[PDB]
Amino acid sequence: SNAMIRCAKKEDLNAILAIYNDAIINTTAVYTYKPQTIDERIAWFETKQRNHEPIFVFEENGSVLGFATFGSFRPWPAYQYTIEHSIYVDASARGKGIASQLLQRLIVEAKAKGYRTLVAGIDASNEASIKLHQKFNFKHAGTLTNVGYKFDYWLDLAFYELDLK
Amino acid sequence: MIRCAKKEDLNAILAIYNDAIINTTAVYTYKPQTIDERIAWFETKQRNHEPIFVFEENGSVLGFATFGSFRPWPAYQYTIEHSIYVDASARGKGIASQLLQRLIVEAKAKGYRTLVAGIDASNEASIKLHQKFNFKHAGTLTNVGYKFDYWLDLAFYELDLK
Amino acid sequence: SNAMIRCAKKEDLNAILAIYNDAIINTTAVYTYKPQTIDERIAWFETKQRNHEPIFVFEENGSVLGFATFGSFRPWPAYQYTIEHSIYVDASARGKGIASQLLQRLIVEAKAKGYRTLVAGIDASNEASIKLHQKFNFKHAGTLTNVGYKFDYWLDLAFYELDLK
Amino acid sequence: MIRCAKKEDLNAILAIYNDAIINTTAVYTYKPQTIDERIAWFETKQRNHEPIFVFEENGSVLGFATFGSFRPWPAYQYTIEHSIYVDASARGKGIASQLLQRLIVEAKAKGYRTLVAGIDASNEASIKLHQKFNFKHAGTLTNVGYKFDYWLDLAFYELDLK
């Protein structure tokens, strides 16, 4: 039972890709329709590396079972102390507290880099994610109704926020 | 008259925008925009077929308005975020209201479902205006911005276009 | 500026009544239609006294500007460590932090009496109350839709909860 | 057969109820009910015109069900909370489902808007049953109950009767 949270590396990308694409195909966790390609994912990784944005993976028994990152919330200079994060856990690996460990690590990194405000965009249907965020003292800041459309129904996006100060 | 913006409008638009940058929390930016960035913005919007409207009176552009993507993921397809800016010397004339009205007309015509405004929590006139046009307060993100040495709260207001 | 939070007394009831009835007439803060009578309010007070349930008032310059209490959440013996509270502030006295001071006092009393769980039933429209409760680390536990009917529209009741442990 | 309960049913009902008190988290009560309290409950429900249904088979009451007030304030007028109890020896027979079906029929006929179930978070069969009848999980209150030396979570499930 060799389990560890570490920064992601290039050799992780394929695993990461699979996880992400599963989420695209089966859930509203990603407001995307088409599976991402490996080149798109590699460009994403290189861009995160250039921007000094973290990517963490949860790895167990040689397998990447989850990943997490943060970056810009809205693209305007005065949002500089605000970041938005995302967390994805393999569907075969749920119930193991992997999301919780990833979020914990994200928060420690966010505090160490001096950000003020951490934002989660969570689909209103994502009950486990909402519960997890409430556990870490995120406050529900609002809900934008009918902002998304997927699987033939309208989607509501809830914003949760943590004051890192 | 409210008409679509043309390249010849750009300088005036820039001025309005930069005033808002320098003096208000209406734009979460610190440094003035340059005319080159504005021109690039214009051409990009022409390319994306996003509308830009100006309010013109006595040959002078007194306000402008536009809408575009709210968040950049494909499933946000039917959601747009709008922006309105009115010349500081042209307040009180109902310009922002006429622009918002025009934006809403354009948004319905193009088949969008949801129109979103990010309004600074202190912009009470804008809030009152959007309430008047039946926008609902969707929420408020606190301390999301930082300008003029203080923390800024962003209120989200939404209109269902259906 | 003589301001104080104290336990309520009989001589407070008239003031309390007015506040309550204002809330009945103008808001969804009380799922009641008809104004309460002074005898009903006195019976309420006597009952709270018999049950050792607290009633606090915020008093300033000789005037009761707010009141607050807690009691049973659901009537079955196994809910004994759970209480539900309510807070009412005079409409002429809003924005003074009176609700916040009352809630603070309620929480200290709840902890001192060994309860585990404090519950707020808040109308989904009551934004100030929701914000106040989030401030004191209540978690939104759920929302019952169309449970109430008042002023010709359907009402949603949100539950917020604080773990007192 | 599912019929309205009669006084002669009460003893059987009591047994069922008390079993649930003694062995499960289905009733947030510690001590067995007495037949006097049950009779008072029955007469009170007759008075309030609240329905009580029993599932009867081979002359034996194998389950019962009822609904009544959810919260005690006038504006909760169109909301009811229901309860279903099935004999422990009569599980697997679809009794709870037939009772719920009957309750829903009765609730619509009487013009209620919202039907509410308080279900212990560990009662997975009840949850699955209510999901089957299109109840929505409205929320969960954690640590609201205490029984058998542990903390209990109450899930609320709701059906819009319109």
Numbering used by the authors:
A (entry chain A), C (entry chain A): -2 to 162
B (entry chain B), D (entry chain B): 1 to 162
Q: What text appears in the publication on this structure?
A:
The Gcn5-related N-acetyltransferases (GNATs) are a very large enzyme superfamily with more than 10,000 members identified across all kingdoms of life. The GNATs catalyse the transfer of an acetyl group from acetyl CoA to the primary amine of substrates including antibiotics aminoglycosides, glucosamine-6-phosphate, histones, serotonin, spermine, spermidine, and other small molecules. Members of the family share a common fold known as the GNAT fold, comprised of 6–7 anti-parallel β-strands and 4 α-helices in the topology β1-α1-α2-β2-β3-β4-α3-β5-α4-β6-β7. Staphylococcus aureus, an important pathogenic and increasingly multi-drug resistant bacterium, contains 35 putative GNAT enzymes, many of which remain uncharacterised both functionally and structurally.
Here, we describe the 2.15 Å structure of a GNAT family member within S. aureus. SaGNAT protein crystals produced in 1 M sodium acetate trihydrate, 100 mM HEPES pH 7.5, and 50 mM cadmium sulphate diffracted to 2.15 Å and were indexed and integrated in the space group C2, with unit cell parameters a = 97.5 Å, b = 78.9 Å, c = 66.0 Å, α = 90°, β = 112.0°, γ = 90°. The refined x-ray crystallographic structure revealed SaGNAT to be an α/β protein comprised of 4 α-helices and 7 β-strands, with a topology β1-α1-α2-β2-β3-β4-α3-β5-α4-β6-β7. Two central antiparallel β-sheets (β1–4 and β5–8) are splayed between β4 and β5 to create a V-shape in the protein. The two β-sheets are held together at the V joint by hydrogen bonding located on the N-terminal residues in strands β4–β5, and diverge at Ser83 and Ala117. This signature feature of GNATs is stabilised by hydrogen bond interactions between water molecules and the amide N and carbonyl O atoms from the protein main chain. SaGNAT is likely to exist as a dimer based on the crystal structure, structural similarity with homologous proteins, and elution profiles from size exclusion chromatography. In the asymmetric unit of the crystal, two SaGNAT molecules were present with a buried surface area of 1,397 Å2, strongly suggesting that this interaction is biologically relevant. Briefly, the binding interface in comprised Ala75:Tyr28/Tyr146; Tyr30:Gln77; Arg71:Glu81; Thr140:Ala138; Thr114:Thr142/Asn143; Thr79:Val144; Thr142:Glu158; Asp160:Asn143. The structure confirms that the protein exhibits the core GNAT fold, and has high structural homology with phosphinothricin acetyltransferases.
